[PDB]
Design an enzyme around this catalytic site. Structure first.
Site, PDB file in Angstrom:
ATOM      1  N   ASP A  53       0.846  -1.150   0.000  1.00 41.26           N
ATOM      2  CA  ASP A  53       0.000   0.000   0.000  1.00 41.26           C
ATOM      3  C   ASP A  53       0.892   1.214   0.000  1.00 41.26           C
ATOM      4  O   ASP A  53       0.725   2.100  -0.840  1.00 41.26           O
ATOM      5  CB  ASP A  53      -0.891   0.039   1.251  1.00 41.26           C
ATOM      6  CG  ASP A  53      -1.995  -0.996   1.226  1.00 41.26           C
ATOM      7  OD1 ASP A  53      -2.192  -1.613   2.289  1.00 41.26           O
ATOM      8  OD2 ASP A  53      -2.678  -1.190   0.174  1.00 41.26           O
ATOM      9  N   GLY A  71      17.956  18.208  -5.182  1.00 39.63           N
ATOM     10  CA  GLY A  71      19.323  18.194  -4.633  1.00 39.63           C
ATOM     11  C   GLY A  71      19.346  18.505  -3.161  1.00 39.63           C
ATOM     12  O   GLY A  71      18.319  18.520  -2.515  1.00 39.63           O
ATOM     13  N   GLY A  73      19.100  19.929   0.500  1.00 35.64           N
ATOM     14  CA  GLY A  73      18.297  21.039   1.060  1.00 35.64           C
ATOM     15  C   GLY A  73      16.881  21.135   0.487  1.00 35.64           C
ATOM     16  O   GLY A  73      16.472  20.271  -0.291  1.00 35.64           O
ATOM     17  N   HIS A  78       8.611  13.553  -0.031  1.00 35.66           N
ATOM     18  CA  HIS A  78       7.193  13.794  -0.242  1.00 35.66           C
ATOM     19  C   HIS A  78       6.459  12.474  -0.318  1.00 35.66           C
ATOM     20  O   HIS A  78       7.102  11.397  -0.446  1.00 35.66           O
ATOM     21  CB  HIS A  78       6.944  14.602  -1.509  1.00 35.66           C
ATOM     22  CG  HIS A  78       7.409  13.939  -2.764  1.00 35.66           C
ATOM     23  ND1 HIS A  78       8.105  14.624  -3.739  1.00 35.66           N
ATOM     24  CD2 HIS A  78       7.212  12.691  -3.254  1.00 35.66           C
ATOM     25  CE1 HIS A  78       8.372  13.806  -4.746  1.00 35.66           C
ATOM     26  NE2 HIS A  78       7.830  12.629  -4.487  1.00 35.66           N
ATOM     27  N   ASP A  89       2.394   6.353  -1.399  1.00 41.72           N
ATOM     28  CA  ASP A  89       3.837   6.136  -1.442  1.00 41.72           C
ATOM     29  C   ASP A  89       4.585   7.288  -0.841  1.00 41.72           C
ATOM     30  O   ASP A  89       4.122   8.429  -0.939  1.00 41.72           O
ATOM     31  CB  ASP A  89       4.286   5.875  -2.870  1.00 41.72           C
ATOM     32  CG  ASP A  89       3.708   4.609  -3.426  1.00 41.72           C
ATOM     33  OD1 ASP A  89       3.982   4.325  -4.645  1.00 41.72           O
ATOM     34  OD2 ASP A  89       3.059   3.861  -2.625  1.00 41.72           O
ATOM     35  N   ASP A  93      14.286  12.112  -0.582  1.00 40.37           N
ATOM     36  CA  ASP A  93      15.368  12.687  -1.428  1.00 40.37           C
ATOM     37  C   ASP A  93      16.769  12.090  -1.050  1.00 40.37           C
ATOM     38  O   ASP A  93      17.347  12.409  -0.036  1.00 40.37           O
ATOM     39  CB  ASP A  93      15.353  14.234  -1.316  1.00 40.37           C
ATOM     40  CG  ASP A  93      16.213  14.955  -2.416  1.00 40.37           C
ATOM     41  OD1 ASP A  93      16.205  16.214  -2.433  1.00 40.37           O
ATOM     42  OD2 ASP A  93      16.900  14.291  -3.237  1.00 40.37           O
ATOM     43  N   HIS A 113       6.421  12.319   9.497  1.00 38.62           N
ATOM     44  CA  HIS A 113       5.688  13.395   8.790  1.00 38.62           C
ATOM     45  C   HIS A 113       5.071  12.934   7.459  1.00 38.62           C
ATOM     46  O   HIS A 113       3.888  13.226   7.160  1.00 38.62           O
ATOM     47  CB  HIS A 113       6.638  14.568   8.606  1.00 38.62           C
ATOM     48  CG  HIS A 113       6.080  15.698   7.799  1.00 38.62           C
ATOM     49  ND1 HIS A 113       5.487  16.807   8.377  1.00 38.62           N
ATOM     50  CD2 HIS A 113       6.047  15.903   6.463  1.00 38.62           C
ATOM     51  CE1 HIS A 113       5.080  17.634   7.421  1.00 38.62           C
ATOM     52  NE2 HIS A 113       5.415  17.114   6.247  1.00 38.62           N
ATOM     53  N   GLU A 114       5.870  12.221   6.662  1.00 37.27           N
ATOM     54  CA  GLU A 114       5.497  11.666   5.357  1.00 37.27           C
ATOM     55  C   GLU A 114       4.428  10.562   5.432  1.00 37.27           C
ATOM     56  O   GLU A 114       3.501  10.536   4.637  1.00 37.27           O
ATOM     57  CB  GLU A 114       6.746  11.061   4.676  1.00 37.27           C
ATOM     58  CG  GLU A 114       7.786  12.077   4.176  1.00 37.27           C
ATOM     59  CD  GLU A 114       7.168  13.419   3.625  1.00 37.27           C
ATOM     60  OE1 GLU A 114       7.675  14.486   3.971  1.00 37.27           O
ATOM     61  OE2 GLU A 114       6.205  13.414   2.846  1.00 37.27           O
ATOM     62  N   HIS A 117       1.219  12.084   5.720  1.00 36.07           N
ATOM     63  CA  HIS A 117       0.662  12.365   4.426  1.00 36.07           C
ATOM     64  C   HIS A 117       0.137  11.080   3.715  1.00 36.07           C
ATOM     65  O   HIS A 117      -0.908  11.136   3.042  1.00 36.07           O
ATOM     66  CB  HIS A 117       1.683  13.081   3.527  1.00 36.07           C
ATOM     67  CG  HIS A 117       2.073  14.462   3.977  1.00 36.07           C
ATOM     68  ND1 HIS A 117       1.149  15.428   4.351  1.00 36.07           N
ATOM     69  CD2 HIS A 117       3.290  15.073   4.003  1.00 36.07           C
ATOM     70  CE1 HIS A 117       1.796  16.553   4.626  1.00 36.07           C
ATOM     71  NE2 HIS A 117       3.082  16.382   4.368  1.00 36.07           N
ATOM     72  N   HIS A 123      -0.949  19.667   6.225  1.00 34.02           N
ATOM     73  CA  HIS A 123      -0.025  20.347   7.110  1.00 34.02           C
ATOM     74  C   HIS A 123      -0.732  21.104   8.260  1.00 34.02           C
ATOM     75  O   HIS A 123      -1.868  21.502   8.156  1.00 34.02           O
ATOM     76  CB  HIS A 123       0.818  21.326   6.303  1.00 34.02           C
ATOM     77  CG  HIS A 123       1.956  20.697   5.558  1.00 34.02           C
ATOM     78  ND1 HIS A 123       2.435  21.183   4.348  1.00 34.02           N
ATOM     79  CD2 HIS A 123       2.726  19.621   5.867  1.00 34.02           C
ATOM     80  CE1 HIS A 123       3.450  20.428   3.953  1.00 34.02           C
ATOM     81  NE2 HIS A 123       3.657  19.486   4.867  1.00 34.02           N
TER      82      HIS A 123
END
Ligand SMILES: [Ca+2]
Ligand SMILES: [Ca+2]
Ligand SMILES: [Ca+2]
Ligand SMILES: [Zn+2]
Ligand SMILES: [Zn+2]
Length: 158
Positions: A53, A71, A73, A78, A89, A93, A113-114, A117, A123
């Site tokens: 899932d 890149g 920073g 996400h 999903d 980074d 945090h992700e 989402h 947020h």
């Protein structure tokens, strides 16, 4: 917005950041899922094969969705809200330096945090909430969801 309409949810780690030990990747993502199932009825299980899932992905630059990474920073990771395919999903980074502690970017904290989402949270305007848009290092051994995080996931589930 979307919520998952099922209790048993699965995840898969697609690949592993070379910034960390493998067991430490497994543990950070494990621990982050537990943050959320501690406050909802959901159960999360790691599968190693086939369609999960929530697919956990380390990638850099343009990576086959329409949300290019930028890149080191800026955008740390996400995730897509509940739904089929790429719904759920969570992408990290690879251009960041993922760690178990306060150096670079704490994988555990970012994953909490992700997966928020992945589960359908947006947020929070509250700097104290984990769903506040900006990454803050807090001690991961004494981490606890803020009141607002709990009100938010609770109004989606449970
Ligand atoms: Ca998915
Ligand atoms: Ca970045
Ligand atoms: Ca990296
Ligand atoms: Zn992506
Ligand atoms: Zn976010």
């Amino acid at each position: 917005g979307p919520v998952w309409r099922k209790h048993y949810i699965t995840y898969r780690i697609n690949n592993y950041t070379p910034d960390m030990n493998r067991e430490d990747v497994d543990y950070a993502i494990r621990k982050a899922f537990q943050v959320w199932s501690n406050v909802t009825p959901l159960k999360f299980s790691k599968i190693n094969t086939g369609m999960a899932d929530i697919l956990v992905v380390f990638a850099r630059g343009a990576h086959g969705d329409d949300h290019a990474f930028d890149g080191k920073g800026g955008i740390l990771a996400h995730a897509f809200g509940p739904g089929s395919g790429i719904g759920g999903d969570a992408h990290f980074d690879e251009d960041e330096f993922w760690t178990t502690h306060s150096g670079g970017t704490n994988l555990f904290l970012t994953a909490v945090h992700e997966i928020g989402h992945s589960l359908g949270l947006g947020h929070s305007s509250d700097p104290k909430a984990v769903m506040f848009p900006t990454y803050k290092y807090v001690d991961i051994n004494t981490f606890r969801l803020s009141a607002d995080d709990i009100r938010g996931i609770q109004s989606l589930y449970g």
